[PDB]
């Protein structure tokens, strides 16, 4: 579990979105595992606007923050699941690190702010859904 609260928006993994999230829908992309819904209160999360490849993410399964090196956002193959058929997920960044299914939602940050959220993992790797290109989150 986990969300990014920036201004009047809540950004969550599309596979984990609630009824409230779909009833207050702004944007959703199944191929990115992202869903953005509207909130009635203000959010103070800063979104990073950068090309950073290092940062720190929260791993709920270890109750710990881990520093990571990660790749550029890209189309990576993701295996089938109860949420999606086997497909290419776009805007995905991979890093070597620990993750478990309940780890989706954990925030990845750099010196400039929120980079993205945990969306995939397995085999000693963690995948992050990038949010740095969604410029409308701050406007
Ligand atoms: C079950 O595989 C692992 C293993 C380690 C870590 C993790 Cl987060 C998972 C879960 C995983 O990657 N999923 C399940 C939920 C939807 C994700 C997606 N974005 O398509 C794909
Ligand atoms: Zn950065």
UniProtKB/Swiss-Prot annotation:
Q: Which residues bind Zn(2+) 1?
A: 50, 52, 110, 112
Active site at 15 (for protease 2a activity), 33 (for protease 2a activity), 104 (for protease 2a activity)
Catalytically driven reaction(s): Selective cleavage of Tyr-|-Gly bond in the picornavirus polyprotein
Question: What superkingdom heads the lineage?
Answer: Viruses
- Subunit-level organization: Homodimer.
Q: What does this protein do?
A: Cysteine protease that cleaves viral polyprotein and specific host proteins. It is responsible for the autocatalytic cleavage between the P1 and P2 regions, which is the first cleavage occurring in the polyprotein. Also cleaves the host translation initiation factor EIF4G1, in order to shut down the capped cellular mRNA translation. Inhibits the host nucleus-cytoplasm protein and RNA trafficking by cleaving host members of the nuclear pores. Counteracts stress granule formation probably by antagonizing its assembly or promoting its dissassembly.
Q: What is this protein called?
A: Protease 2A
What organism is this sequence from?
Coxsackievirus A16 (strain G-10)
């Amino acid at each position: 579990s986990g969300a990014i609260y920036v201004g009047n928006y809540r950004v969550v993994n599309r596979h984990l979105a609630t009824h409230n999230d779909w009833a207050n829908l702004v944007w959703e992309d199944s191929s990115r595992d992202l869903l953005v819904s509207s909130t009635t209160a203000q959010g103070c999360d800063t979104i990073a606007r950068c090309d950073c490849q290092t940062g720190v993410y929260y791993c709920s399964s270890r109750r710990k923050h881990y520093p990571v090196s990660f790749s550029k956002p890209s189309l990576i193959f993701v295996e089938a699941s109860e949420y999606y058929p086997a497909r290419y997920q776009s805007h995905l960044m991979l890093a070597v690190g620990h993750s478990e299914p309940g780890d989706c939602g954990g925030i990845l940050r750099c010196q400039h702010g929120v980079v993205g959220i945990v969306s995939t993992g397995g085999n000693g790797l963690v995948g992050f859904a990038d949010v740095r290109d969604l410029l409308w989150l701050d406007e």
